[model samples]
Target: MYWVRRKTIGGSGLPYTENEILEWRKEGVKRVLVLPEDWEIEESWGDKDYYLSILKKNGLQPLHIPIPDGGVPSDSQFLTIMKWLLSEKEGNLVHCVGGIGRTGTILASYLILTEGLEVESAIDEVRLVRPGAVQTYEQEMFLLRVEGMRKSWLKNIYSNS
Candidate 1:
């Protein structure tokens, strides 16, 4: 039941700028989830009060998922946040430096591991959201590792049934 949208960056860098944030507000985005790259200081990205203020004005909440720069987050970390996101009632917007590789990978894994979606199905869903979603070979391999995997519900259902 959880969903995500991909926001593309024209070029590579850290979080979106204040101008971009304003644009997102104009676009009716209620929350901003940032997945920063290495060397991109979250602090230096923009003004905190205005950033928080923008989120408030636009009804958006900003979240940063730190992934050690140029690396994919561990499956556990990915799942933890995914659980929170799924539990929440609000829509989620996850964007990395480019919103292509890192965020794509995590979102794919979330589908395969937590949602029990096949790898191909997960990839297709991501593509629907972000037509240009590209996963590196490593990311694809990791996603395959989680392919068709379920999160305990199957066992419980079968035993109880």
Candidate 2:
């Protein structure tokens, strides 16, 4: 989270209460980017909408981009996510089931692609705070694969003079 220059993005488990949402707002978070699917929330909140409404009423934009447990997000979704990471002047509060696998993957891959960290270093950077992050072998390999792929479309996103 602090790894980003703004030090605003954070990864965590779901915060189901309005106070928790407010606490995050004070910490500079403006949006809650949720990564778990509906069934996953059934054991936590009775319904996803109930949980999302809590965040909305507390003044945070709740974003849902569900991924299977231990899976990486699709390329387009990941890029859209990267856009928010780079564009958010405030902050992003991203989360998954327990805030390790998918969350860590997104953070690490961002480090690798944008900051040029090696696979291990990127993982190390995220794990420095969220120990036991990058939980599965697939997640680890996903970062590795990301390191080799290339794309230039993002160059035009916010083109400057």
Candidate 3:
């Protein structure tokens, strides 16, 4: 759970048990961002909402924005989620199936948007924390693209102001 330096956020693989949920709260995670579709497929995959409900019962805010497995989320999706991440100062968690590509891409973008690290630097920092992060070449490129989009967005905001 202690995968990163921020302490405010952590990256991880899936959490299947109630204890995992409790431990995340114990570690001060106030919000959890789950990046997978919610589906019920017998016990092979219980309803994702079931786990989310556990998080809610434990007093955590759970946000679910399903990112396709092994794929990058859209820029708008990233911005919406990043807006949520920026709004709260409390600890948060971002997780995907393997805690690598999808989660790392979003986390790197968060660093760029908030911490002002360039794409590569932000990605490097993410890799340092969760050595397995940013799993695919496409994911790395996606972060670069997101940085470009974010920069343009800021420029427009400033220009309009």
Candidate 4:
């Protein structure tokens, strides 16, 4: 758990700048998942493209999956991110505006789907690292539904095998 230091699926109070992005790189962050709903909002926090270019220049993949603030994305949206999370190696960073609701929901779902953790346990784990996560009841419900869907998906995979 100590290795869970500033890296992994952590969040920030505000969006990241180049300096912060570099700091994450120093901490071994090799991939980034940008979860903010609007590019304009993200730009208000910092230079979005600059942050993303830094990751790309450093050989870190940058994934942008815009999730509306305080709202859950469609099933296909979650599946897209889940596919990436399941296939990619470790060191992926998930972030959204203020780094709480949207990010937390996706990260918690990842823990449940990939790590086999229970839904509440997953939410607790994320909130421990990123305070104020899973802001509304909708976000919480989304994670629960995602957990069930992911489990069924895995079951199908195993059955096919």
Which model scores highest in TM-score? Answer: 3
What would the per-residue lDDT of candidate 1 be over residues 69-158, giving only the tens digit for each residue? 446767666555455455443445566666777767777765565567888888788777666554567777767776634645334323
- Tens-digit lDDT track for model 2 on 3-54? 2335466787766555766777777878878889988876778898888887
Give the clash total for candidate 4.
Answer: 0
Candidate 1: C-alpha RMSD after superposition: 6.0
Over 4 Å off, model 1: 1-15, 41-58, 113-115, 152-161
Which residue pairs collide in model 4, if any?
A: none
User: Which has the greatest lDDT?
Assistant: 2
- TM-score per prediction, in order, is 0.65, 0.84, 0.86, 0.80
Worst 10 residues of 2 by lDDT: 150-159
Pairs of residues clashing in candidate 1: 30-60
lDDT of 4 by residue, 24-138 (tens): 6776767777777546444654566765666688777977777777887677676667667666556777777677787778777877877878889998888887777788899
Q: Please rank every candidate by TM-score, starting with the best.
A: 3, 2, 4, 1
Candidate 4: which stretches are off by over 4 Å? 1-8, 13-16, 40-42, 45-51, 155-161
What lDDT does the true structure give each of the candidates?
0.57, 0.76, 0.75, 0.69
Q: Candidate 3 on 1-161: residue-level lDDT in tens?
A: 65554667777767767788788888888888888666521132477767777779889898888888677877667656876776686687898876777888888877776677889899889888788778778788888887777877555434533
lDDT of 2 at 22: 74
**How high a TM-score does candidate 2 get?**
0.84
